[PDB]
Design a binder for this molecule. Sequence first.
Ligand SMILES: [K+]
Ligand SMILES: [Mg+2]
Ligand SMILES: [Mg+2]
Ligand SMILES: [Mg+2]
Ligand SMILES: [Mg+2]
Length: 117
Amino acid sequence: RKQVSDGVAHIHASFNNTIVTITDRQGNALGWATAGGSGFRGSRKSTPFAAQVAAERCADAVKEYGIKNLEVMVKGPGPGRESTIRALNAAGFRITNITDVTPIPHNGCRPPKKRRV
RNA sequence: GCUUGAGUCUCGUAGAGGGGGGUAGAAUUCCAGGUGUAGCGGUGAAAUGCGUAGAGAUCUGGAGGAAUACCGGUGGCGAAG
Ligand SMILES: [K+]
Ligand SMILES: [Mg+2]
Ligand SMILES: [Mg+2]
Ligand SMILES: [Mg+2]
Ligand SMILES: [Mg+2]
């Protein structure tokens, strides 16, 4: 058991799912939650409401650790990016700073072929 | 015979013009290790598929291949490609 100030939160917002992971600043996981685990299944997994409920669930699963004044980062283009941080703020965590990171390949490798629909 | 076409010499200017050799950063994949955990992925909707042997997530190190975000253009060079 530990009390931590300025813990780290990672949001992974895909188009088909959303993952929230709370780790120490050094990247050792303390807790995690998904919209898939929140009881949703299939298309509804992508709704921002599912992201918010997954965020609440992760906050509950991490409340034991005295996390406060948390620092969060968001990655991915999926919807509900702001819903997750809204849920985190409402959960009672003091939010100090937030950062955005998304990989940019600088013309690395060939992507898959366009989808004929 | 002549200098107006054509060509030679002196001084400068711009350019993804070509051939050879080095080197750098970002990203995907694989491998090893740390945290910890029951889902991940995909779709109109699903299923096939991957996960307790420890996945997906997150942090550290390594391997290898390919291509050069922004500048970037309404831009430039080449006989054309
Ligand atoms: K040349
Ligand atoms: Mg040149
Ligand atoms: Mg050259
Ligand atoms: Mg590992
Ligand atoms: Mg020309």
